Amino acid sequence: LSKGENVPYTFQDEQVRSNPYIYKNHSGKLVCKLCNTMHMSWSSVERHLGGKKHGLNVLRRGISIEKSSXXXXXXXXXXXXXXXXXXXXXXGSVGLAIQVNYSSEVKENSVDSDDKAKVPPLIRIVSGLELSDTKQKGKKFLVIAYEPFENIAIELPPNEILFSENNDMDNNNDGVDELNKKCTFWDAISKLYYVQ
RNA sequence: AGGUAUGUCUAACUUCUCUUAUUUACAAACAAAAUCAA
Ligand SMILES: [Zn+2]
């Protein structure tokens, strides 16, 4: 569960840490220096991190820094769709555009009970800091998801591309987020999802 | 030769409740079984 990381003792006088918080004191137990909470096992440590308590102390420490100045029934065939990445350009910079194609009424003929069928594909930017394997990380992914088909990701080394500035005139139908409404199109008649 | 006089030149701002559950460690040289004319 430790994912092979080495947490140095508090007295070893600090290699960069994943979270520079959880330590081991003079004794063998694990502690959160901010929260000042002792934890028996790494599982308890992860409960602490996933707990609201630790988070509140993180926000308090950030304030100190500024001062110092449906999920169940989800069908899953895990089928990799076909993406068509292509370097785009407009004006005045460079942006990316993806063309994802979906089934041709091949298997979607057995499921038509208006169960989120009206819901279009959704995209989100995920940090690689969390993976099923947790080995390497440090870059973002433009994940795209649809109920039956399997998720898809696209690595984005560049810190920022096509991140525009008030493209439209501030109209508020949040849909899912500014990203989706701002720059996505869902040709539902042909089943083609464009993203740029 | 000496002395005097005159002139000219040259130098010098401090003292992290409750609740009900789950997770995980730990303590007590804690106790370990059988036999019974016990
Ligand atoms: Zn903490």
Is the Cβ atom of A38 within 7 Å of strand B at any atom?
A: no
Answer yes or no: are the C-beta atoms of A176 and A168 closer than 8 Å: no
A143 burial level (CB within 10 Å; 0-12, 13-18, 19+): middle
For residue A102, the one-letter residue type is Y
- Rounded to the nearest angstrom, the distance between the alpha carbon of A140 and the centre of ligand 1 is 26
Q: Which strand B nucleotides have any atom less than 7 A from protein CB atoms?
A: 16, 23-25
State the DSSP H helix or E strand holding residue A179, giving kind and residue range, or none if neither: helix A178-182
CB neighbours of residue A130 within 10 Å: 8
Sheet (strand A22-24) strand order: A22-24, A30-32, A37-39
Q: Using the structure, give the distance in angstroms from the CA atom of A64 to the C1' atom of B35, rounded to a whole number.
A: 73
What was the structure determination method?
cryo-EM
Q: Using the structure, give the distance in angstroms from the CA atom of A58 to the C1' atom of B31, rounded to a whole number.
A: 47
A195 burial level (CB within 10 Å; 0-12, 13-18, 19+): buried
Structure resolution in Å?
Answer: 4.0
State the DSSP H helix or E strand holding residue A181, giving kind and residue range, or none if neither: helix A178-182
Is the Cβ atom of A27 within 7 Å of strand B at any atom?
A: no
- Beta-bridge partners for A184: A195
The token pair at A145 is 């998801």
Helices (H), A8-142: 42-50, 52-68
- Rounded to the nearest angstrom, the distance between the alpha carbon of A141 and the centre of ligand 1 is 28
Q: What is the rounded distance in angstroms from the CA atom of residue A127 to the CA atom of residue A145?
A: 16
